A paper describes a structure:
The T4BS secretion coupling complex of L. pneumophila comprises the inner membrane AAA+ ATPase DotL (IcmO) and two inner membrane/cytoplasmic components, DotM (IcmP) and DotN (IcmJ). In this study, we determine the crystal structure of the cytoplasmic domain of DotM and observe large patches of basic residues, leading us to hypothesize that DotM might form the recruiting platform for Glu-rich motif-containing effectors.
Thus, a shorter construct (residues 153–380, referred thereafter as DotM153) was cloned, expressed, and purified. DotM153 crystals however diffracted to 1.8 Å resolution. Residues 179–188 in monomer A in the loop connecting helices α1 and α2 were not resolved, indicating flexibility in this region of the protein. The pear-shape structure is formed of a narrower end made by two elongated sequences emanating from both the N- and C-terminal regions of the sequence: α1, α2, and part of the α3 on one side and α13 and α12 on the other. While the structural homology search and structure-based sequence alignment yielded no clue as to the function of DotM, functional implications could however be derived from a striking feature of the DotM153 structure: its highly charged surface. Peptides CegC3, Lpg1663, and OSM that contain a Glu-rich motif exhibited high affinity to DotM153 (KD values of 0.19, 0.7, and 0.35 μM, respectively), whereas Lem21 and LegC8 which do not contain C-terminal Glu-rich motifs did not bind.
Residue numbers in the entry:
A (entry chain A): 159 to 179, 189 to 380
B (entry chain B): 156 to 379
Write the structure that this text describes.
Amino acid sequence: WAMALTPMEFARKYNLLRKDDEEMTAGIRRGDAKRVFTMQLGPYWDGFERCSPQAYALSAVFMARMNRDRDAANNILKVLDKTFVDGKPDFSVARPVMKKYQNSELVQEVVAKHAYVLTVIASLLEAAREDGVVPSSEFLWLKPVDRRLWYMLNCVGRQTPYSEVAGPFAHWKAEKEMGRRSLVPMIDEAIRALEIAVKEVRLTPRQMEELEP
Amino acid sequence: KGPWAMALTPMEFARKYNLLRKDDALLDNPVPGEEMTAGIRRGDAKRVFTMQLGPYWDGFERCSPQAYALSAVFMARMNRDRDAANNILKVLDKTFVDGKPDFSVARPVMKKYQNSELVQEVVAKHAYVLTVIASLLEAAREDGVVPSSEFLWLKPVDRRLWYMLNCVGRQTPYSEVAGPFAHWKAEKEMGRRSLVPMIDEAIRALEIAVKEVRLTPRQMEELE
């Protein structure tokens, strides 16, 4: 499906550009950007049963790999790949695995330290990678099912996220740096990165004339 | 709807292409076994199935870039160069995350293997791009498993190619590739390539499929 938005396209898509007051450059609406990034953070973690089916199922894959059970992990990934051909993925294949590993030590440690679904599952993926490679390419089907999740998970191991998940990315890294879960959004790093990225791009005269204060 | 839609069932396919009609074989001589069932417009069905066949094979360089690259992957497998095959699959996968795939990555492998004996045997025996590639996939599966999983990304770029390759090893194809599947089988049965479309099995199968679905009274009356 669609390419990830660049910082400028993202800013334009969410009406984040402002007259600043270097030539032919826009500023950012910080309050507005804060809210957009806060919106990207998604739901609080509050038991895996309340996760979307896709986050449920990939969490289970990663829990399996953390607990060194490649077979259970590959069986989910395998069934989801086939069933995806067919038309609708069978997320229920993940239920047995969740039941078995959701209360394991290494998983409880991740859940303890992260307040949002997206930041839990990012750290489950990071931890699963201490066992083996776990590429996005084992779960190609995710992009059309859930774009935000796909982008979050493809940013695990990266320095700089896609703007469309810059919120949950910044929050995730803030939680790791604080050493605790945070329910208060910690997304300021996403704002500063957007401002920097936007000031690098020149606007045309038409685009400058369309800027409001 | 959109690039990710599920495959049409036979009855949905027949409706989409206006292939249903009143069946005058059971109007003129009703069988208890078949009340309330439509017939198929055989001439319109031939056209539609023939339109799914796609272009003649005429040098891999004339193929779509996705058909090009996948052919190269299967070529490499047929020739037992798993590394060259997997590199293409890695690069295609990486590039699909965010932007647009590196199909050019396939060019060295195509250059290398396209005139190989096992590839020349397949190309000799099939007349259409879809039928060539189906047979390259079937041959590449002599080497090892080559699941359609690995080219997940094809579905959005080329719906037809994706369903075609997912029916390799199936006994019954999706209606939307029933034409080239039928033709590919007819080629293997004849033992030569055929430019004349051999899509009769696609029509028979659609007729049979449609006869299994009871219509409502209203639906029977709307039939022409």
